[PDB]
Structure formats: C-alpha cells, structure tokens
C-alpha cells in the first residue's frame with residue numbers, strides 16, 4: 065500500500081539516527097538508579113525509548129509531537145459526524161504524518177478487508193464459561209488468533225532478517241487492529257445483550273462500525289472515536305504498553321504481545337480505575353446526598369470527610385502526571401456539549417472545581433488533579449453502557465492503536481530483548497552498609 | 499497448612515528489612531543508565547528486586563542461596579527414584595528452607611487435592627484449532643482459569659488489605675502450580691498422542707504423575723523432576739519472570755500474570771532455543787557428517803565453517819552468564835549416567851569440548867560457553883518426546899515454580915506498580931548534543 069511504502073521511507077530515515085546514538089553516544093549517562101526506585105517498580109527510571117507518544121508531567125500527552133486539541137483539530141473528520149476517523153489516528157501514530165482525506169480512505173478500505181473475526185474465536189469464547197470476566201475473554205480471543213501470525217510464520221519458515229522483520233509485524237498489526245473492535249463487540253453482545261449479534265457494516269468506519277455492532281445509536285459513534293483516540297497511547301512505560309513491548313522483544317508476535325498486555329490492563333491498578341470512579345460517584349449521590357445532585361457545599365465538605373478519615377478520591381492522581389490530564393479535559397468538552405444536564409456528569413463537573421483546592425491544602429499526593437478515568441465512565445453510562453467490567457475492554461481496543469504501532473517500530477529499529485538485572489535484599493543491604 | 503503459617507513467619511521477619519531500606523536508604527544510588535542501555539532493552543540495569551534466586555554471571559544460578567548441586571544434594575528424594583520431589587523445591591523457593599521428608603509430603607498431599615483440570619479448560623482447548631501452537635494452548639488454558647482466581651474475588655469483594663494480600667495470592671499459586679503439569683500433559687496427548695488421556699494417579703508425586711499422564715516410562719519421571727527443578731527460576735530479569743512480575747504489579751492475579759509470562763516464553767529469543775539446538779544437531783549429523791557420530795576432528799573444523807561464514811552456534815551464549823551454565827552441567831551428569839551411547843548426546847558431548855576454545859579465539863560474544871538449551875532437547879528426544887514445539891511447554895511448567903513464588907513475595911512485601919519513564923530519540927539526541 066501507500067502506507068507500507070511511506071512507513072518504509074520513515075524507517076530508512078530513522079535507522080541512521082539510532083545507529084549513531086548507539087555507536088557514538090552509547091556511554092552517555094541519562095539517569096541513575098536509587099534503592100527506592102528498584103524496590104518501587106522502577107518509578108522514574110528513564111529506561112525505555114518510544115517515539116509514538118511522549119508524556120510531559122505538566123502539559124500532558126503528545127502524539128507524535130501533537131497535543132490532543134491539535135490531533136482532533138487536524139485529523140480528517142467522518143462525513144456526518146463531529147469526530148475523526150480512528151484509522152487516521154493510526155496513520156499518524158505509525159508514520160508521524162497527518163494523513164490527507166485520501167490516505168485515510170486507503171487505510172479504512174484496508175481495515176474493511178481484514179475485520180472479519182475467525183469462527184474458531186467465537187467457538188473459543190463460547191467454550192469459556194459465560195460468566196468469565198470480559199477482559200479474560202478479550203485477551204483469549206486475541207491469543208487464539210496467534211495461529212494466523214504472519215510474523216510467526218516468517219520466523220518459523222527460517223526467513224527472519226534483521227531488516228525486513230517489521231514488514232510481517234506490520235501486517236499482523238493491520239490484521240489485529242482491524243478485528244479488535246469486532247472482538248470487543250462480540251463479547252459485549254454475547255455477555256450483556258442476549259447473545260444476539262448485529263453484523264459488521266462494510267460502509268462504516270471503525271468507530272461507526274463498533275457502535276453499530278454494539279447496538280448503540282448516534283452519537284455513540286463519536287463517543288467511540290474520541291474514546292479510542294484518547295486512550296490510544298500514553299508512552300511505553302505504562303504496564304500494558306510496557307508488557308507488549310517486553311513480550312515482543314523476545315520476538316513473540318503481536319498476538320502474544322497484545323494478549324499479554326491485556327493481562328496487564330486487567331489489573332485493578334491499571335484498567336479498573338474508570339468503573340471504580342463511577343460506582344463511587346453513584347454510591348455517593350445515593351447515600352450522602354440523597355439521590356439528588358448536591359449543592360456545591362454538601363459536596364465541598366463531603367470530600368473532607370472521605371479524605372481526613374483516610375481514603376483516596378478515585379480518578380485523581382497519577383504516577384507521572386502532575387497536572388490536569390488533557391484527555392480528561394477533552395471528555396469534559398464532549399460532555400458539556402452533549403450531556404450538560406445528566407446528573408452524574410454534574411457531579412463530576414463540580415468535583416473538578418472542588419477537589420483540586422482540597423488535595424492542594426494537604427500537599428500530600430504528587431498529582432492533585434484529575435486523570436481520564438474521572439470522566440470516561442459517566443459518558444458510557446449516559447449512552448447505556450452500564451456494564452462496568454466492559455469499560456476495560458474499550459480501553460483495550462483504544463490502547464492497541466499506540467501499542468501495535470510501537471511494536472512495528474521496535475522491530476523496525478531492531479531493539480533487543482529487554483533483560484534487566486535483578487538483585488536481592490541481601491545485596492541492597494550490603495550496599496547500604498548494614 | 500504448616501506451609502502457609504511458616505511462610506507468614508518469614509514474611510513478618512522480612513517486611514522490616516524492606517521497610518528499613520526504603521525509609522533509611524532510599525536515595526542510595528546503585529546503578530546508572532546509559533543510552534546503550536535504554537535502546538538495548540535495559541541490558542545490565544539493576545532495576546529489579548527478587549529473593550527467590552540470584553544469577554551470578556560467573557558461578558551461575560543460586561536458589562535461595564544454594565547452588566544446583568547443593569539443591570539436588572539436600573532436597574528429599576522420591577522413594578524408588580534418583581531425583582527430589584518437585585514439591586520440595588517449591589517449598590524451598592517459597593520459604594528459603596530445605597524441607598523435612600514430612601513437610602514435602604504435606605505439600606504433595608495439597609497438590610493432589612488441587613490438580614484436577616476444570617472441564618471448561620478442556621472444552622476451551624478443543625474449541626481452539628488443533629493445529630494451534632502448544633504454547634498458545636498452554637497460555638490460554640491458564641488464562642481461562644482466571645475465572646477461579648481467589649485474589650480476583652478477594653479484591654472485587656472490597657477486602658483488599660495491604661497486609662493479607664499475599665494470602666489469596668498464595669492460594670492461587672498452590673492451585674495453578676498443582677494443575678500446570680496436568681495442563682501440559684493434556685496438550686501433549688490431545689495434539690501428539692491420538693487424544694487418548696491417561697488419568698492422573700493420586701499415589702504419584704508431581705514429576706512421577708506428569709510422566710504417567712505423558713505416557714512415558716521410568717526414568718522419564720526423573721528426567722521431568724530434574725528438568726522442572728533446573729528451569730524453576732533464573733532471577734526476575736528474564737522476559738517470562740519479568741513479564742509476570744510486571745503484570746502482577748498492577749494487582750492482576752497469577753492466572754493473568756502467568757498467562758502473560760507464557761506469551762513471553764513463547765518468543766524465539768526466550769523459549770525456542772532448546773528445539774533450535776537439537777534440530778541443528780540433527781541437521782548436522784545428517785548432512786555434513788553423513789548420518790553418523792563424527793570424529794572429534796570433522797566437528798572441530800565444521801564449527802569454523804559455520805562461524806567464519808557469519809552464523810551463531812545455538813545454545814552457546816547468554817545475556818548475563820559469562821561461564822558454563824551449571825544447569826547445563828547437571829543435564830550432562832544425568833546423560834553420562836543414563837544415555838552415554840546415544841548418538842545425539844555424543845555430539846553435544848564433543849561440542850562441549852571443541853566449541854569454547856573456538857568462540858574464545860574470536861573474543862567476540864561475551865559468553866563463550868553453553869547454557870541449558872544446549873543439553874535439554876537431546877534428553878527429551880532420547881525418551882521419545884520428539885515433538886519440538888512442546889519443549890517450551892515443559893520449560894513453562896518448570897518456570898512456574900519460581901515465578902509463582904516470586905509473585906507471592908511481591909504481594910507479601912507490597913511492591914508497587916512497575917512504571918518506568920519513556921524518552922524519545924529526539925530527547926536522546928538533545929542529551930548527546932545534536
């Protein structure tokens with residue numbers, strides 16, 4: 065395609081830059097490791113290289129240099145609709161370039177050719193007990209499709225070549241990316257919607273087709289597009305992206321890598337923040353404030369009760385971010401436009417005002433501000449996605465855009481297996497002098 | 499049980515040591531990161547803490563302070579048989595203590611109660627196409643069983659508590675460890691042995707029962723015990739151990755974590771080294787040396803042809819080890835005793851002599867010596883495990899001993915989510931001065 069040729073051009077430009085850094089600047093130090101960091105999950109260590117996205121603690125996430133407002137600004141929009149083709153965002157992450165309306169249509173056509181789910185994947189999901197958590201089903205659907213890996217075939221057929229490895233990896237990426245929304249939708253329907261299935265519509269973009277298969281009317285299509293774009297990447301240090309990176313560095317294909325990543329995303333400290341926020345808002349509107357939108361004041365002092373009796377406010381606070389998440393802000397902008405009068409949004413809205421002043425007084429948590437998970441669930445809820453456990457599957461579809469693009473580049477640039485060194489407590493104790 | 503109480507005692511002893519390092523010595527530097535290392539998969543960075551095992555580049559692996567010859571020396575042996583109870587090695591990795599003959603028998607009894615495979619896992623593996631790679635089937639069998647996670651239940655029921663989290667995680671560990679050999683054997687039989695199944699024998703230890711279900715006679719029982727013990731851990735920096743650690747640090751249960759780890763182990767640069775060795779020995783005996791054990795001399799100069807025409811010797815060279823792997827050596831000791839006259843062993847035997855002098859001349863690769871994978875496959879082959887792809891599944895059963903023990907401790911000591919920081923090539927280029 066044009067995309068594969070274009071991507072080959074970028075790779076040839078980028079390989080010299082990388083080769084130079086290694087040969088001429090390999091011994092330049094860039095960070096140091098303290099004991100607190102080895103025990104505390106490498107927190108803060110500059111140990112990974114990614115170009116797909118960068119998280120500044122302050123401004124937020126940039127995708128290939130662009131801010132979120134810029135990306136939503138410049139990406140080609142869907143005719144009839146407010147939001148960009150998810151396919152265009154994928155182009156941007158792979159190439160670095162904003163695509164023309166013509167280049168987006170080539171990708172969209174390529175996705176349509178590839179979005180059909182194998183029958184055996186459906187058979188597999190049925191064989192798994194229906195009461196299995198949806199993220200388990202999601203990860204197993206991906207895993208099962210490893211049978212179709214082009215990369216695996218390439219390697220196992222003895223044709224592995226340091227230079228052209230990214231090529232099959234890119235095909236696996238196009239294939240897996242085109243099917244994940246269908247997979248997600250199948251799980252939604254089989255678990256939550258009486259196991260009746262709406263077929264994919266070949267005339268629809270990825271986001272439009274997802275809403276279709278989910279059975280949800282406009283503007284859920286736009287909700288979906290936005291959501292997937294917002295959750296598309298957050299550099300390569302987060303557990304899900306880092307896991308895929310790590311697995312793939314052993315030359316496991318994208319099916320293995322992305323299955324592993326979803327095992328990471330299913331963690332309560334990663335993928336469950338969104339539901340645990342909404343539940344807690346719904347529990348609060350019901351109990352403390354009597355099933356009614358509070359006044360600014362009963363909320364203002366309700367936060368103090370939760371806080372100075374020893375409990376977190378969920379969806380405030382992050383292990384890198386120190387400011388408002390602009391992903392949060394973009395949710396807020398959709399919600400002002402589209403659901404100003406929804407009760408649960410109004411409680412999120414007020415929390416934005418009242419909660420940062422109060423987490424500031426305590427000077428306690430290193431991020432006194434909201435992340436995305438504060439705002440995601442209330443939008444889903446409003447459009448009838450009331451099945452909390454499924455929110456993580458949505459996250460998983462979105463995050464694949466960034467992760468799969470990152471895996472292509474990792475193979476493109478020939479990055480080696482990730483193999484750090486371990487140490488014992490005995491060893492750390494010797495170095496401390498004990 | 500005794501094991502759970504004993505392990506609670508060790509945890510209470512160990513938490514203070516850890517708490518001290520953090521509060522009193524958190525800023526002590528232990529390493530630095532260069533550009534070479536960020537681009538080259540964190541190679542050499544001391545970034546992980548594990549107490550289960552330590553890999554010295556020179557002496558090799560120690561399990562809880564003991565060398566391999568020590569572990570085989572001191573662990574209680576199976577009556578009738580040359581090798582230790584695998585259950586005892588598990589006790590050692592969890593506790594740090596060599597168990598009495600009486601403590602091994604309690605564990606063995608606890609495994610017997612838990613080793614039955616859920617029906618739905620068999621249903622799942624049947625739904626997956628029978629031509630699926632066995633490691634895909636393995637990882638998905640584990641993943642499917644996440645439905646039974648006690649840890650997940652514990653967390654989701656709102657009972658999470660920093661102090662007692664290891665308790666359900668230990669139950670998941672006992673349950674998953676007890677079933678993995680059954681899972682492996684089911685896959686062997688269903689794929690390779692006409693899908694007829696030998697039932698588990700309640701009178702047999704883990705290693706004996708595996709050989710039983712595999713359908714292989716003595717001394718395969720001892721082959722299995724040894725193999726699982728040798729492959730039980732290799733500190734927490736390797737891709738499979740590191741992946742489970744990483745996933746589990748988000749509080750994903752051991753089913754998710756160990757499933758993700760197997761996605762890593764299936765990588766060619768991790769789990770496929772064992773078959774890629776044997777195939778290459780068999781290809782060589784057949785072509786260059788005419789279907790017959792060479793003399794020392796035709797082999798001696800055959801290595802030079804492969805080497806100075808730009809190709810690796812498989813199963814020589816490792817990303818940490820700088821000497822002979824003592825895991826290799828222990829394979830060699832089994833094989834001298836039990837199969838001195840096997841053709842393929844005789845070629846491995848000679849390679850040990852001839853290949854280190856020659857990789858030394860070149861002073862090229864930082865480990866001019868063998869690892870385990872050089873010796874594993876020939877032993878399997880000799881006993882009729884001729885199905886190459888399955889070797890990695892054996893690895894996977896063995897490695898669980900270390901990894902699952904490591905996950906219990908990670909939760910015991912409350913280790914935080916692994917979230918390092920990413921940087922761009924642009925940023926690395928700024929720091930180099932460009």
Ligand SMILES: O=C([O-])CC(=O)C(=O)O
Nearest residue numbers: 298301302303334384435
């Ligand atoms: O955790 C991170 O670094 C970013 C992210 O993906 C998340 O907020 O879940």
Ligand SMILES: O=C([O-])CC(=O)C(=O)O
Nearest residue numbers: 483731732735736737817
């Ligand atoms: O240490 C390594 O990278 C290889 C390994 O995991 C193992 O042999 O178990």
